[PDB]
Scaffold this active site. Structure first.
Site: not given
Ligand SMILES: [Mg+2]
Ligand SMILES: CC(=O)C1=C(O)N2[C@H](C1=O)[C@H]1c3c[nH]c4cccc(c34)C[C@H]1C2(C)C
Ligand code: NA
Length: 980
Positions: A337, A693, A689
């Site tokens: 990410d 995700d 995070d």
């Molecule tokens: Mg993120």
């Protein structure tokens, strides 16, 4: 209703047959409630440490020891009128060992906290509907919302269901879609249809998504879908994908356990194919099982893993699942990410400019740069990379003034976390931070408490001008303004100003002047052209920043003349502007990310960015962090989620091998990309995070969450970087590979012992010899006396070149080729040295000499044929000494093997046997536990043993010692006449 975003407001109303002004009837509600169900995600339980334990015995390797334990329990019940005091020890140790392993296996895959429970945290419990039986807005439980009813949302609301927007009642509706996009930036919703039937969440600006929240505005909509049929529902379905999977090493273990079981049930067809009425099989078949199985492996495996975790904890990496501590060791692709992972997720103003001087066709700008990657008011302003005072430039004084006043956000010091946080939009807080760094009035801030320091300089500016009101942002104008008067002035006084900020194009067109210091001159083509050129460069290169023009209206209209309740008039109030300056912001990479990318590349690892954010800023970041070269072309190497959805299956699959940047993506796109990468059988990691995700984090072989990220991401991961250090991922790979190397060598050592115990029992049955070793003994050998040195081997200072080769292939087997031939043969020397000594005390020994022409084979005839070739007693085969000499040889051989396992190919001549002090100290702990079975009074009974003479042990120390030379012969041929 499917594709509600592609329809119009009336079309959606028609679809359900409701009016925007009465809503559903309680009749319609009952029906829809029946047809669609309740507005909620189904909970996922997580099984219990009962049927988790049941699933422990579910594999074939322990299905053997459970069957054997029952047969051993049958053997313990039907004992002769002899030693019945503790003959049940055999079956009851095994049964304890199984449950002891069962508990150890479950405990390492820990954490009862559920990912779905964390996901339902985004379900509001309450919602707001207009229904037919009441005029006023009703407030019901969110779980009772049904497709079709008219829902109302406002500032601070968690969106209760997937909704089609009907009418926006404020000038704008601002939304936070970070659970679907990972971006906090508030999104500006409209009501116009979005034709494209395959629009992506980011494209559906006419929709509200459940679990997201309203940053600003008030809106009315119609519910499209509820429960599991929502965007957060999709995320949920992929969290329930509990299709029980294991790490790439566990699969290698399971396969190795499946190859080992097709050895036991292969020696049973061997033993049977040599020859009540058959108690000889169920006595030696049990001895075969216990022998082949290296029980205690879990203990020594768990320990190796445990010390990796504990070692990793000191690096601020929390491993929520023990086996995962090795996974990154054999990872070829790391998917990552961007926002909050690769970057800080703290919007920062890194560049800004004002006008320097104007002269006919000549225009020059004072450009500045600003450091700091956080919201903290720490950093400095540089011109030409040298520090300056912002307050010396009058244009920067106005720049700061505009940024401080044209702003609905602020900054706050979080004392519990010891960090500065935003309050409102990220883009506006960037302006707050900017103003505190600039400190254009030289306010003294060095001695303020950190909480006072947060808004000190903004407060100074707020002291000079009174903000009377804001002309809030509108779509047709792409800018906002604030009407201000000089504080300490009267309503009538002149000196009122409007301070404007917005999209450079529109704002700049509405300028008729440019500010120069404290002066002002006409806007001209050459001046405009200059300004626009730097705004263009700043927002397109590898800068690709987000640029705001800053302006002021020097003569705003009189309050009275301005009609505030009509926003379509705001643009014309914001005309005859004076251009002041430009600011450029981006969410910046974490400082250690670049280095980490290079070290992974060096270890043969691919890094791919998968982000909900936009392609332009996705690519720019990729260049900043080394995923792309600064000038490298990327037309075919970067894709948006929608471009990706256009490619056919095979093209998408290949894209994951070719591309490195995936942008404007949905949660599903992340897991799809991971899925494709896995179809090329690549071991792949995911780093992130956000809630968006989670799907990808779960589907990866290892999911790695950021410490300061979301609870969802963390509960979906196996590892959390508590301090958000991306460098730790590199260290994790190193540790992960060291772990694999440790296992590789202590499995060789233990299986060496195991193959020896198998051959021994294959000879004491095919040569009809007397019982050489017993199950009761082997269990103590493999768990305690072999386990300790094996656990001691884990204290090896890791190889110094472990990070220089590429990751091992997934198809590469634990042990094969020369290593098999190696331990297989060592398992033969052991299988003949334990048989030898057990038979040698019956022949060439003075303490019980039998017929020394090989006539020991016949133990079939004791009281049966006492007048035969006998000479003496009967109860002499069940003697302790033959088993004592067989055991002491087995044990002493492995102590050399432990000293042999200190290196794979380097001789003990070139690598001293006193390298590992923990190993030597383990041999002492092995000995003082082996001699503890002999002298300690109650023990020599169950294990049937008795201490030996000085000569007795000297025959042990002569049949065990020449194993070093046997392995040394295997070491020479390997290091020389094989390879190298
Ligand atoms: Mg993120
Ligand atoms: C009851 C229980 O939890 C377990 C066990 O009690 N074990 C492992 C095991 O899973 C067994 C096992 C499965 N796969 C392999 C590969 C290699 C060696 C072993 C195993 C040993 C087995 C044992 C007994 C350690
Ligand atoms: Na997984």
């Amino acid at each position: 209703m499917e594709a509600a975003h592609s329809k119009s407001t009336e079309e959606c109303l028609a679809y359900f047959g409701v009016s925007e002004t009465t809503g559903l009837t309680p009749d319609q509600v009952k029906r829809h409630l029946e047809k669609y169900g309740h507005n909620e995600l189904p909970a996922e339980e997580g099984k219990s440490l009962w049927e988790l334990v049941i699933e422990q015995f579910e594999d074939l390797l322990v299905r053997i020891l459970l069957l054997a334990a029952c047969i051993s329990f049958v053997l313990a019940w039907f004992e002769e009128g002899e030693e019945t005091i503790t003959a049940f020890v055999e079956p009851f140790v095994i049964l304890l060992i199984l449950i002891a392993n069962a508990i150890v296996g479950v405990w390492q895959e820990r954490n009862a906290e559920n990912a779905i429970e964390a996901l339902k945290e985004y379900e509001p419990e309450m919602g707001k509907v207009y229904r037919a039986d009441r005029k006023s807005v009703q407030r019901i439980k969110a779980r009772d919302i049904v497709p079709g009813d008219i829902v109302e949302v406002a500032v601070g609301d968690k969106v209760p269901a997937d909704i089609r927007i009907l009418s926006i009642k404020s000038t704008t509706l601002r939304v936070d879609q970070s659970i679907l996009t990972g971006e906090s930036v508030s999104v500006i919703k409209h009501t116009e249809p979005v034709p494209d039937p395959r629009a992506v969440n980011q494209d559906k600006k006419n929709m509200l998504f459940s679990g997201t929240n309203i940053a600003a505005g008030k809106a009315l909509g119609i519910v499209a879908t509820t429960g599991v049929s929502t965007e957060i529902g999709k995320i949920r379905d992929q969290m329930a994908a509990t299709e029980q999977d294991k790490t790439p090493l566990q699969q290698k273990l399971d396969e190795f356990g499946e190859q080992l079981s097709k050895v036991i049930s292969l020696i049973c067809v061997a033993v049977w194919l040599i020859n009540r009425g058959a108690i000889y099989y169920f006595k030696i078949a049990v001895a075969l099982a216990v022998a082949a199985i290296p029980e205690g492996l879990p203990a020594v495996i768990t320990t190796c893993l445990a010390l990796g975790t504990r070692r990793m904890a000191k690096k601020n990496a929390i491993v929520r699942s023990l086996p995962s501590v090795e996974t990154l060791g054999c990872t070829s692709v790391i998917c990552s990410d961007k926002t909050g992972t690769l970057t800080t997720n703290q919007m920062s103003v890194c560049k800004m400019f004002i006008i320097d001087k104007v002269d006919g066709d000549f225009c020059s700008l004072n450009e500045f740069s600003i450091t700091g990657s956080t919201y903290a008011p720490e950093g400095e302003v540089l011109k030409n990379d040298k520090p300056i005072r912002s307050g010396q430039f009058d244009g920067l004084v106005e720049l700061a003034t505009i940024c401080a006043l044209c702003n609905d956000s602020s900054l706050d010091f979080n004392e519990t976390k010891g960090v500065y946080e935003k309050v409102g939009e990220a883009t506006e807080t960037a302006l707050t931070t900017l103003v505190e760094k600039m400190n254009v009035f030289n306010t003294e801030v060095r001695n303020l408490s950190k909480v006072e320091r947060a808004n000190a300089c903004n407060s100074v500016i707020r002291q000079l001008m009174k903000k009377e009101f804001t002309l809030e942002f509108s779509r047709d104008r792409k800018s906002m303004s604030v009407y201000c008067s000089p504080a300490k002035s009267s309503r009538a006084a002149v000196g009122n100003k409007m301070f404007v900020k917005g999209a450079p194009e529109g704002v700049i067109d509405r300028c008729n002047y440019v500010r120069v210091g404290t002066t002002r001159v006409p806007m001209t083509g050459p001046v405009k052209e200059k300004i626009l050129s730097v705004i263009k460069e700043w927002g397109t290169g590898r800068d690709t920043l987000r640029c705001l023009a800053l302006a002021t209206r020097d003569t705003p209209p009189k309050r009275e003349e301005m009609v505030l309740d009509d926003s379509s008039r705001f643009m014309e109030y914001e005309t005859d502007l004076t251009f002041v300056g430009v600011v450029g912001m981006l969410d910046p990479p974490r400082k250690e990310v670049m280095g980490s990318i290079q070290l992974c590349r060096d270890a043969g690892i691919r890094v791919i960015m998968i982000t909900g954010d936009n392609k332009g800023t996705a690519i720019a970041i990729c260049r900043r962090i080394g995923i792309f070269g600064e000038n490298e072309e990327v037309a075919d190497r970067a894709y948006t989620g929608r471009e990706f959805d256009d490619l056919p299956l095979a093209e998408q699959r290949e894209a994951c091998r070719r591309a490195c940047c995936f942008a404007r993506v949905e949660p599903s796109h992340k897991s799809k990309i991971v899925e494709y990468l896995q179809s090329y059988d690549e071991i792949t990691a995911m780093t992130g995070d956000g809630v968006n995700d989670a799907p990808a984090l779960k589907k990866a072989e290892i999911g790695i969450a950021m410490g300061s990220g979301t609870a969802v991401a963390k509960t979906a991961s196996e590892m959390v970087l508590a301090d958000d250090n991306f460098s730790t991922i590199v260290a994790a790979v190193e540790e992960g590979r060291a772990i694999y190397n440790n296992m590789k060598q202590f499995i060789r050592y233990l299986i060496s012992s195991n193959v020896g115990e198998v051959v021994c029992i294959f000879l004491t049955a095919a040569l009809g010899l007397p019982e050489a070793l017993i199950p009761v003994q082997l269990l103590w050998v493999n768990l305690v006396t072999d386990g300790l040195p094996a656990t001691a081997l884990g204290f090896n200072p890791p190889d110094l070149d472990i990070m220089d080769r590429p990751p091992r292939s997934p198809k590469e087997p634990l042990i094969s080729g020369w290593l098999f031939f190696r331990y297989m043969a060592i398992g033969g020397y052991v299988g003949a040295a334990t048989v030898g000594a057990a038979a040698w005390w019956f022949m060439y020994a003075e303490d019980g000499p039998g017929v020394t022409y090989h006539q020991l084979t016949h133990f079939m005839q004791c009281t049966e044929d006492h007048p035969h070739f006998e000479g003496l007693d009967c109860e002499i085969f069940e003697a302790p000494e033959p088993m004592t000499m067989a055991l002491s040889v087995l044990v002493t051989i492995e102590m050399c093997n432990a000293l042999n396992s200190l290196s794979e190919n380097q001789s003990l001549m070139r690598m001293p046997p006193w390298v590992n002090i923990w190993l030597l100290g383990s041999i002492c702990l092995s000995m003082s536990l082996h001699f503890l079975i002999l002298y300690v009074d109650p023990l020599p009974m169950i294990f049937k043993l008795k201490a030996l003479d000085l000569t007795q042990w000297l025959m042990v120390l002569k049949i065990s010692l020449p194993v070093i030379g046997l392995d040394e012969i295997l070491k020479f041929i390997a290091r020389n006449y094989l390879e190298g």
